[PDB]
Symmetry: C3
Amino acid sequence: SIRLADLAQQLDAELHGDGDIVITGVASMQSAQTGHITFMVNPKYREHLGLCQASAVVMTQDDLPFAKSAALVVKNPYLTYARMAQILDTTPQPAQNIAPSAVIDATAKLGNNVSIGANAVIESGVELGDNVIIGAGCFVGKNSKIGAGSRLWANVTIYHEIQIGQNCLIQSGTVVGADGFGYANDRGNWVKIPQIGRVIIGDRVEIGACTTIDRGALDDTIIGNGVIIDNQCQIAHNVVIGDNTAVAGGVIMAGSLKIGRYCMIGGASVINGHMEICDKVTVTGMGMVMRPITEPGVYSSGIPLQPNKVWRKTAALVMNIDDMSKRLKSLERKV
Amino acid sequence: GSIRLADLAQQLDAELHGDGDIVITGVASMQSAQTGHITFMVNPKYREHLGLCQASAVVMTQDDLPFAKSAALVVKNPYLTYARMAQILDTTPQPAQNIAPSAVIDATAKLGNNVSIGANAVIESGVELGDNVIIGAGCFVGKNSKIGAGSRLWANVTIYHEIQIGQNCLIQSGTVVGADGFGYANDRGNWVKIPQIGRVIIGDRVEIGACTTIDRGALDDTIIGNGVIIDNQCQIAHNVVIGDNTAVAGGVIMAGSLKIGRYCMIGGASVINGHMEICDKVTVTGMGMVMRPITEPGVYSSGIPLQPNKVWRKTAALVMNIDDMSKRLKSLERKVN
Amino acid sequence: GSIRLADLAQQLDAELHGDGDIVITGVASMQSAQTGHITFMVNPKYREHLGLCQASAVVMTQDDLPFAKSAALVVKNPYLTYARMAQILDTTPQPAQNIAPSAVIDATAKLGNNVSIGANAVIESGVELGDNVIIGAGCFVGKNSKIGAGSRLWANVTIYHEIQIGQNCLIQSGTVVGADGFGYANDRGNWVKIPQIGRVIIGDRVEIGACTTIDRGALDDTIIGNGVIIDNQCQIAHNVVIGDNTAVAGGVIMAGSLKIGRYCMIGGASVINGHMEICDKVTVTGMGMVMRPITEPGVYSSGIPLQPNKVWRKTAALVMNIDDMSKRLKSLERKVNQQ
Ligand SMILES: CC1(C)CC(=O)c2c(nc3nn(-c4ccccc4)c(O)c3c2-c2cccs2)C1
Ligand SMILES: CC1(C)CC(=O)c2c(nc3nn(-c4ccccc4)c(O)c3c2-c2cccs2)C1
Ligand SMILES: CCOc1ccccc1-n1nnc(S(=O)(=O)c2ccc(C)cc2)c1N
Ligand SMILES: [Mg+2]
Ligand SMILES: [Mg+2]
């Protein structure tokens, strides 16, 4: 809980109202009650602010005349919302103290204020930085290094020789450093190629749940600083992702793909390998990415939903589009 | 556990034709069934094949009865009766029995009667487990989460904090309920985390497959209705609401703030956009690309299916250049008219 | 792990040119290789670059040998020899060593010789682990399941009950084998669970990636043939049958009762529908949308690739209206036919 005037100061917001109001948490505009702060981005909500029951509303200067409560004026309410949700965050930590049921190899090095959850398993040679938190049931493999401030939720798997920077956060079920999908072929029999490269994750990387990031075959899989990756993603061996790129849920990447900085990869996209995507590329959802992308901008693919009756005809005609093309050529000749 | 055929038929509300004292030990497919097994016939083309079936009894309809070559249970719906009798004769073990000495259970957790918790499970402070709840080995149940009577988690399931799960649910291994939604604000190209302080509310009789992820809401909640079934490796993003009795097949990826109505059927590998609504009684066939809201019930589909690669190369190129085809068609229409 | 270059060459059936007494400590890429490393060349474009490589030895072909600037191992297939030498020099640790005091192992479990079980792994009643089996930290292996000699599970792998795994398999973390298939009857809109009392049968020399799921069968079994390789994030539904040596790339989804033949190659993120068969020696390129049986070998593809968004918007609109384009074409043909 925090006085509104204090909160406004920390947010660098211009306060219009009673600064002694006590704010206990953040809430949606439709749910907010006394003690909650909320925010608005869409002008459509101006007319019904009299129905919002928040103690304070974050808004812009143009919104201020419509205010029906204490207001914090800022240029970017959504960004301010993020900041104030961090100030008022209620999320617990994955662990506190070192659990006696954890199994920690005698050669592991733990920094100051490290917490390790129940039944977590820490291999030989691991290095955990100051303030690192390892959730219950995690596995951290041999010689892996996790930088200060980083946190794993429960049941995360880190393989061996992995490097993770500072202030990262990895959600449960995720696996970092599994073997890449590397095989030679001897008369139809697959021959495993040991995957002896690593994964290097930079600082401030956030990874969702049940996501897999494979180790490289010889050199490394690299996740740059500030990257955010959603749930259910596959990042194959020797992928390289530039700083601040965002990868939405269910994206599948093939090996040796290089993605630049400030990219936005839409959910359920499929990105083929041994190719590069330059900085500042957006791929919209379900994109089928087969070719290098050399110019910034927004790219898309796919034929979207239709009523089944209509789709049946759409699909048949597209599958026979070569015949259509020939009929059009023939008609052009006759004319 | 074995059961007399008469007693089985009574529990199934079936008409017995044959020896009620036959002892049934389990369910089997028509081709695999041996003595002691009960099986079922849904396809009348097998009527002539019943003499080759070595089951001790066969579930069938009244129209099938003259074709029986064994004890028969006559029902209106052999498939539904199959489901019921497989439940009665289920050999599936429980995820755990009793409370394992290797489980780590906070002193403030509230355990109901007949709760079982498997080896090395971890139960946080304030957790409430209702009567007959079973937690598999290696599970994690985060702070203050509540699991209703009769619900069961297989091994290695992760439940985060402040999650609510109703009664008689079943969650398969690897599933994660309540991870942070994918919430970030952008500040001059840098991502700023938005804490996800909503929850997940899961209703009664919900079944969730393996390695599915259901993220907690940003402020308000992610909600799964009663009787919902969700297959493996789905992503249900923050603030999705799924209406009662909807089915979601495997590998479906949903964006945030999608609302799905009751009695929908979402085919495997579909992709669904967010901040929009799908009404009740919508079916999306497999791999559906659902970009826009669906306001009318019925069946919807997308996608161009497989062709020989040589063919596909031309199909793809011609489609990508379809605007040129369109212009040539218009130009030819003007030339002819 | 260090080995003399002459002995490595003998084990690789390679022709040594250079100092057999050189000590090789590991494999490295051509760009990263340093003293003590062996590397390989598959692209002759790098012949002029070999003077810049600091490896102690380079695997190459007879045609490459005159361009060597180091000890050389001459072989017919440098890529295959790389795979073999990376195995000889593998630095990958084992998932576990010996039996961890924190593992919870049912008294009725049967262990072969030289079995290792990692910390906090849980082994149910009736489980059988063959010789040299390694169970990683935190795994679960359910009742009566059998894991054959030489097979290894990384950490946090889940095996359900009555599962059979062959010899020399490798399963990466987060994978779940034997969960319930998606089986339900329907009583007036209410789903009625069908217990899934079939199993999963996995053959010998199967490799499975991370966070992959393979459901048990409803009555009959889900079957994975010998020598199959399966990538991360795959979904193999109940009663799927996969033939020997087939390869499944990452993110593939297979629906129930699909039968795939031998020596198939399924590209990443493909979607294969069920109750149908794919014959031997079929390749489905990535993101393939497989709706019908495939009865002939060869390569099959689907999908319209990426375009600039503004271009895609027009493409999609025209395709969605392609039936009107068809009707206009037929109408125009009729006019040119003078009818
Ligand atoms: C719940 C039920 C008893 C009935 C049902 O409707 C259904 C079931 N299993 C499915 N598997 N796949 C699938 C899985 C992976 C890839 C491709 C397809 C579907 O699409 C499935 C569907 C549906 C079909 C159309 C809408 S939902 C079993
Ligand atoms: C098994 C092998 C040694 C050889 C192989 O054939 C193969 C391999 N890795 C792949 N990754 N992806 C992929 C992954 C994610 C997104 C898109 C594509 C494929 O499609 C892959 C394929 C195949 C190509 C065509 C059919 S299978 C390595
Ligand atoms: C599906 C998961 O998608 C996300 C998850 C988290 C964050 C952003 C996205 N995301 N990515 N692309 C889009 S989309 O609107 O271009 C889109 C295009 C086509 C379809 C069928 C859906 C969505 C969204 N909403
Ligand atoms: Mg323990
Ligand atoms: Mg997918």
